[PDB]
Amino acid sequence: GSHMNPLTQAVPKCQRWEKLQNSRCVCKMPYECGPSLDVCAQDERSKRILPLTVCKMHVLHCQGRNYTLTGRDSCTLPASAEKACGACPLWGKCDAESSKCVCREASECEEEGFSICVEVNGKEQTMSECEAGALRCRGQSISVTSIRPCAAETQ
């Protein structure tokens, strides 16, 4: 007989830079992103270090664009550190009447948030963008190794 359920047997899970359409996982659009971690990447044709952001890089990467990642000192990011009220990311918001921006913790991760590999505590832990970002905002010492996940998650 026919399959009662399409060939996945559940709803297909697509990656952070992907969206499920036409029964497949396709990439989203890079301009459909904003809330993501700002990183320094090198353009393969220009060889310039340009500020990219995790979703931008990921989506554009799966769209067939080639970019090499560089160090956090290679470029200057819009948000490389803490922000102030009037301009806050997804891991940071303006608090109850102030001029500052407070950095939230991982427990307030509401927006999508990618999964990245960051070396914290001397270990490479895959955490969510909202978490790693919160850390980078609050003052936790974090060393982003890559915008891809770590092999921390392996059972």
Side-chain angles (χ1 to χ4, degrees), residues 38 78-95 98-103 137:
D38 292 287
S80 39
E82 58 186 273
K83 297 282 66 175
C85 186
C88 295
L90 59 301
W91 49 75
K93 297 300 176 186
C94 182
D95 65 283
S98 66
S99 305
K100 69 183 187 306
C101 189
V102 66
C103 313
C137 190

Side-chain angles (χ1 to χ4, degrees), residues 32-105:
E32 290 288 275
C33 281
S36 37
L37 281 171
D38 292 287
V39 292
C40 298
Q42 182 178 30
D43 182 86
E44 285 297 279
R45 178 54 176 86
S46 317
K47 293 303 190 173
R48 60 185 292 189
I49 310 296
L50 63 166
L52 290 182
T53 320
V54 180
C55 181
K56 183 65 66 64
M57 151 73 72
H58 267 288
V59 169
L60 137 171
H61 200 264
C62 67
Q63 300 185 330
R65 301 288 67 203
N66 311 274
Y67 281 82
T68 302
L69 292 90
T70 49
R72 65 91 201 235
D73 297 89
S74 305
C75 75
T76 303
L77 287 318
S80 39
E82 58 186 273
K83 297 282 66 175
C85 186
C88 295
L90 59 301
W91 49 75
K93 297 300 176 186
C94 182
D95 65 283
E97 188 181 276
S98 66
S99 305
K100 69 183 187 306
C101 189
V102 66
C103 313
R104 318 301 289 212
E105 303 184 280

Side-chain angles (χ1 to χ4, degrees), residues 2-12 23:
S2 304
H3 291 107
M4 307 72 177
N5 294 88
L7 299 183
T8 306
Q9 294 189 92
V11 182
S23 299

